[PDB]
């Protein structure tokens, strides 16, 4: 309850950041992926094209605002919140199908195509994009270039392709691969025609599934670019660290292949801005703690608060910031030490003053 004259450390001063600006990309780009949706010709369902995408920035907004797709189905994730969510790999399964068979392509349905060509599992989180392009993949006289499977011995595992051309056996008598009795070919040609209606034209159906495993994000959606702020205690995340500090204008340039910068003490204190190739320094804001100057018990009641290594009645001393004690140019013998050759005392009403000590 009684405090004597001297410096007492009570707590620490923390400069909490007020803004959090994050900027990974600078612009938007995409790898050649639309070529499989705009190719000269497609593949059948017995042997469909399989595409893998790796290490490529890609947005799905362009693949939606075409205003030309007749149908669109994506389960597992909301269509408007899939870009910011990040996965590992995207599998593209492109094939052709008729107008009466787009109904059967859904998780949990039976039929003759969804069970014999491509089985959809219950935990199917992909998107199905289908549209009509009958003016290119069909021609007069009968377009029979596309194939599909009609017969199979038993069920097939999902995400499995079958290209077996063996003749399916219905009974117990072998046929030795002839067009005889009690056997039939499993592969049958399509019936595409440019003068068809709305339920038997060749539609292009693609499947965009996602991979979820113990791997970092490789191909997903980029981020937006916020405003650049400098000389303020602002938290940032420039591709390797969530650091809070001021961003001053540096005078040292980097080699044109580096992104980070460390020091002798091995602390990341320099990062190149991806927006304009600007080299910015990093310096922490919270420095030191606080101290209280007390004249003593039965002498005074007011106190002076000293900041240790913080840059700002108020006097900017060489040992931080001192508030609550006026500065006087004369010098006496000092009693309460502060540091850097300047002390504080209680003299003439009477108030706490700070002065350079006399030797």
């Amino acid at each position, epitope marked *: 309850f009684t405090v004597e004259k001297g410096i007492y450390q009570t707590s620490n001063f923390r400069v909490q950041p007020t803004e959090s600006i994050v900027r990974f990309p600078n612009i938007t780009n995409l790898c050649p992926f639309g070529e499989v949706f705009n190719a000269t010709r497609f593949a059948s369902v017995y042997a469909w094209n399989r595409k893998r995408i790796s290490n490529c920035v890609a947005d799905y907004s362009v693949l939606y*605002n075409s*205003a030309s797709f007749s*149908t*669109f189905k994506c389960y597992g994730v*909301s*269509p*408007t919140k899939l870009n910011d969510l990040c996965f590992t790999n995207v599998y593209a399964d492109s094939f052709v199908i008729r107008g009466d068979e787009v*109904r059967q392509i859904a998780p949990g349905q039976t039929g003759k195509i969804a069970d014999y060509n491509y089985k959809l599992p219950d935990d199917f989180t992909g998107c199905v994009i289908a549209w009509n392009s009958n003016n290119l993949d069909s021609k007069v006289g009968g377009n029979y270039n596309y194939l599909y499977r009609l017969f199979r011995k038993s069920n097939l595992k999902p995400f499995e392709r079958d290209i077996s051309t063996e003749i399916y056996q219905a009974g117990s008598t072998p046929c030795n691969g002839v067009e005889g009795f009690n056997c039939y070919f499993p592969l049958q040609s399509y019936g595409f025609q440019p003068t068809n209606g709305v339920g038997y034209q060749p539609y292009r159906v693609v499947v965009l599934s996602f991979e979820l495993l113990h791997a970092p994000a490789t191909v997903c959606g980029p981020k937006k670019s916020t405003n650049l702020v400098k000389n303020k205690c602002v938290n940032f995340n420039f591709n390797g660290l969530t650091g809070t500090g001021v961003l001053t204008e540096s005078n040292k340039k980097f080699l044109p292949f580096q992104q980070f910068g460390r020091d002798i003490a091995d602390t990341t204190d320099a990062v190149r801005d991806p927006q304009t190739l600007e080299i910015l320094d990093i310096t922490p804001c919270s420095f030191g703690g606080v101290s209280v100057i007390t004249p003593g018990t039965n002498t005074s009641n007011q106190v002076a608060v000293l900041y240790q290594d913080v840059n700002c009645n108020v006097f900017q001393t060489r040992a931080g910031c001192l508030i609550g004690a006026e500065h006087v140019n004369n010098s006496y013998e000092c009693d309460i030490p502060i540091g850097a050759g300047i002390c504080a005392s209680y003299q003439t009403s009477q108030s706490i003053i700070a002065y350079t000590m006399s030797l």
Partner: antibody
Amino acid sequence: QVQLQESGPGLVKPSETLSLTCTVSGGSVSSGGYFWSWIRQPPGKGLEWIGCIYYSGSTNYNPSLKSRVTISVDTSKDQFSLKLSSVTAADTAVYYCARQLWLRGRFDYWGQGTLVTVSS
Amino acid sequence: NFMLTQPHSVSESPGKTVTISCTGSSGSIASNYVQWYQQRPGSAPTTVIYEDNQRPSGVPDRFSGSIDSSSNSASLTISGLKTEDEADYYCQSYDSSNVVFGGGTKLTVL
């Protein structure tokens, strides 16, 4: 959040031009990559889709309402307006300016419906 | 020429389960997303379901939707009818760059 408020007169004469503008507060027209659409509803009848617009010049109109819907977007005033031609007595419907997040999906935010009456 | 067919008048006593249908004529009902809107009289319509099975934040769990794609009919199941449920129900579609709404259903109390 964001809100959608309509303006324009509540009356229009037959065989005239309708001018209804819906203004936006708490958001930006161009930012975010969302759509705008106008939807009307006659009293005692179901909702009828008129047309949809983007912040660019992309427009799509109903086939029954084609060649009569003119909708424009002015980003400077942060609003979009719809112009209708050859309005008849059967055009009496409550006009709703609804924000549309997904082009094939829900109209998440609906503005309050202004009453439009056509009389001679 | 794709139009959604809805029951014009549907009535059910409170506390029971009722099913509201939405049948497509030409296009299949699993082709495009179906949105159900519950509109109070003299009020703006509000979205009560989206993606044909997902309930938006704010609506009760009872607004459950199911898709019967074989019959080309979209179904919306209501369980535990209450007083505030008396409103107009409309089902939405997209077809091909032309949004098409439903006929309308008038949830009734008795």
